[model samples]
Target chain A: MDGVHDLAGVQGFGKVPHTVNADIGPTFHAEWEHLPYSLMFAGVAELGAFSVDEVKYVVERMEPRHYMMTPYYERYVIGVATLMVEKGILTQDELESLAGGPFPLSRPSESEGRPAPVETTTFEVGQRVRVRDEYVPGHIRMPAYCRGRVGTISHRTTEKWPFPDAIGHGRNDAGEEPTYHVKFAAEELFGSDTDGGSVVVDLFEGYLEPAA
Target chain B: NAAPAQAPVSDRAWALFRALDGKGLVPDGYVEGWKKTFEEDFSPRRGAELVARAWTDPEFRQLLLTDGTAAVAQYGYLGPQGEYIVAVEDTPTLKNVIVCSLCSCTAWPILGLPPTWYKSFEYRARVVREPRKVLSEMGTEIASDIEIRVYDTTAETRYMVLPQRPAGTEGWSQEQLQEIVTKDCLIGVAIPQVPT
Candidate 1:
């Protein structure tokens, strides 16, 4: 899904609200800030509930306006709580009753998500690859900025992992594939407007094709 | 009919905890273990120590540059999002920075939990496209001649920048060097500085 979370290259953003070595205080800011990730670990490591990818997709599945208004850790709190309910480990009534009030969850997944491409060729460094010009309505790792753009393969991961699209939706068909570091000229990605010399995106194998 | 009154975030957060713990699903001290790990073990100090060693040890520097995971593991710094480390090298003519445009997929154990600025929508939106301007506004002015290479951490391969060791610290100890290798330096938003 091309969610609001894909904020890369979009314009009109102001300065990042920090300077060099500014005091960011602590690793977590609030009493509840750590709950999201910590309990997420309990769900993953203890209960075998969901993949980390699913956590990310659920956060993306947050109703758009809510996502924009919520803070980073708070989003995870929502996402993780949403997952607990979705996985049937808990219920909204239980959550609300425990809270003594209402509790909302991420929108139900729109797309069940795609399976890993069974026929992806192993790409090598120095090869030119184009991000497959495809739009996925479910969880995908490819950001919209690099979709359909061409770039050179700078490196490829030796290790492989299950594809996000499949695993993010709790499907078992998330076959493993390595990712390539695809390097693009700044001009190719953003025309002459970009100030960077180059951008390297770590793209999964299924998302690329031999650049024509 | 109107929208239901939502619970406060703290209530909702703890409610999720109670709901899970109630089922005897969550392990004893599981959340506490992760919280300790996130707060204490996961730190930029680990990355700083790695940078300090890399700056002083040529072989380690080569190892860090070529196979960052092994180098990180060698120092016992490998964990969580840092399982597959790829340390990008910065040179006089080239600068490297890391971002996750989609979300906050940082090398948590080494680089610490991403700072608020790094996780902010503005930084995620603009850094990949206009890094020179972003870095400049963040107070690291990249020369017009130096190439600014932005690494978007889109996949599982976690990244840390091996920022070029600044001058005036030639005789500095590893401990001294570590002090200057701040989180921003490792993130490439700001380079290390030595007071003149």
Candidate 2:
């Protein structure tokens, strides 16, 4: 028994290994919905997307560590369903019945409709900036490595997307808000060699800084 | 025509500061204080523990590389506010070098917290392609023979490099052996070796 630790191997270690900030994807909806069900159920019904089976499948693969780790409302849809089944609000049979049944996803026209526009200040040409870096416990669409490094504002994209940090509550238990992007020079990141200036990234508005 | 150069701050630095402050984004003066604390905490000595443990125990090192989040959490070193983990394992042909391919997705549970430099978009896009160059800039130079593979933290798994074992000291104990492994070993900058 001493030769090998626990089933995972070695005794001195505490928990199982998982990558820091590995992208879990929206697939973690299972855990998210398990949070506050009432609100999410309303949102889901209003949005009219995702059948119960689709929801269940996602939840089955949900890891507790990820669920416990992601943003707040981001997990809303899944939390609702988690409670539904566990609390008996929705029986397995009822959910199963809904699965593959005739259900309307979002109306194509309305769903395809563009979102509301917002105003934003673009970083000036050759603006010095630094990327905003942060680590959230759950799966994030953004990559984990690019947070908080210094760079310059290379280009500014269309100022259409709203700030999720300002509106949508991410599953950040730390309650950190989100932001959007200005690109960076690869040279600034890596160095003078290897096509440094050619590489660029679109960082969130929050991740920028005046280059020293 | 020439005005005194303003202190280097982001154009929206003041507004963003107020935005973050107004929304109570951080504890008062916590941002500046935390920056200093982060440097102190993320020093080489701090990262050496995991590096050393990996050297002595092959199985433990494997666990650390494969599942960085779970592996480090077991050590009770989970950072403030429970951060996500990103570990980049080193290999022979392809060194698993990590730069926040998007932002800094570091192996915080083991490495404490990421350095402020880890999170630039510049680091994100370029690291995956030109890892050796970036590391070289960060004061880490790669051997001409080594090929660095930049792993972005988008997948479910995260990691730290398991530097190839150091030469000599075949009979070293975990404690004695642990001393030889530097943070750079874990970060894939160097192989652990018995100090001469």
Candidate 3:
């Protein structure tokens, strides 16, 4: 989805707060943060109602402004609750009665449990490919910076994982494309003289076509 | 330095959590269960221990590099967000860092939840574009001659940086060695330093 949550290479966000060291930063900043973190895992692992992909799907689909304004665990709580409601595991009315306010209605969706057949590899290692320029309006893993930029296929991952775009919409197939690790020069993404480095991103087959 | 303030949990989120709990949707004692898990699991001690072992044991290091899941299993560090693990070893010539880029996907089972900075918009946006500068701001200064490689993790794969053993600890015990391998070292933002 074209959302603020797709933050790769976007600018104007300033310095990362360097206050907490790795050893010093607490996992949960507050008491309430733990519930969502725990329930997120429980909902996926124990309930088996949704996968991790779906959790990300809901978070990605959050309203653009809300996505940026809300805190990280806030997104998780909302995403988990959204998934539970979407899957019919919990009703909005139930939440309304508990929280004492009306909750948003969620359309029920189901997964067919079968992934789409994988396509034969289209691009080989050491071959150049460009990310598709299409503006898909829902869940997607490809960041905007890499779009239409030239990159080399560093490696082709075996096995097709569930595609977020399809999975977010509750489909099992429709997007079961081959996955590849595409490498791009930092200059290609951040412009020349930025630095000497390389960025490798995971891209699905549908998002790529042979570059000229 | 002040910790990032937590916004009050929304009533909608609270109610939904209660609804799920009241309806018995989640397992009993889940609140306590996860609290305990986070308490122990979130600590960097486990990751430090694994790194210390890898520094001492070549065979273990090979196992860690080849199949992180199986290697960490020997020490009981396996679960959600760590299902398919890949340990990226940091060498003198090469460096590594982990980010989801799209969101805050992290190796929770081993490294715990990511810090606020790791999930900050600033980090998610800048790390992939200018890692050297970003790392420098985080108090980690990488040499200009060294190469930086950033790993963008997804649901199917998780990465952990196996930092090189700090010099001058030739005869350190595993316990002594574990003390220096902090979580940042494992994340490749900072290198391990033997305490003075």
In model 1, the runs with Cα more than 4 Å from the true position are B1-5
Q: Cα lDDT of all candidates, in order?
A: 0.91, 0.41, 0.75
Candidate 3: C-alpha RMSD after superposition: 4.4
Chain B TM-score, structure 2: 0.61
lDDT score of model 3? 0.75
lDDT of 2 by residue, A1-212 (tens): 00100011111322212122223233113321222322233324433333322232232223434332333333333334343344344443443333323111111111111111133234765676665444432222333334565655533443233332222222112122223333344444445544322223444454455555
Output the number of the TM-score-best candidate.
Answer: 1
User: B1-196, model 3: which lDDT tens digit per residue?
Assistant: 2223332467766676688877787788887788888877655677888898999999999999887889988988887677666788788887888888888877777777677778889988888988888998888888988888887764366678998787899989999998888777777788888767
Ordered list by DockQ, greatest first: 1, 3, 2
List the candidate 3 regions with Cα displacement exceeding 4 Å: A19-25, A101-133, A153-160, A174-179, A205-212, B1-10
Candidate 2 residues lying further than 4 Å off, grouped into runs, are A1-212, B1-46, B80-88, B112-125, B132-147, B154-158, B173-176, B193-196
The docking quality of candidate 3, as DockQ, is 0.44
In model 1, pairs of residues that clash are none
DockQ of each: 0.72, 0.03, 0.44
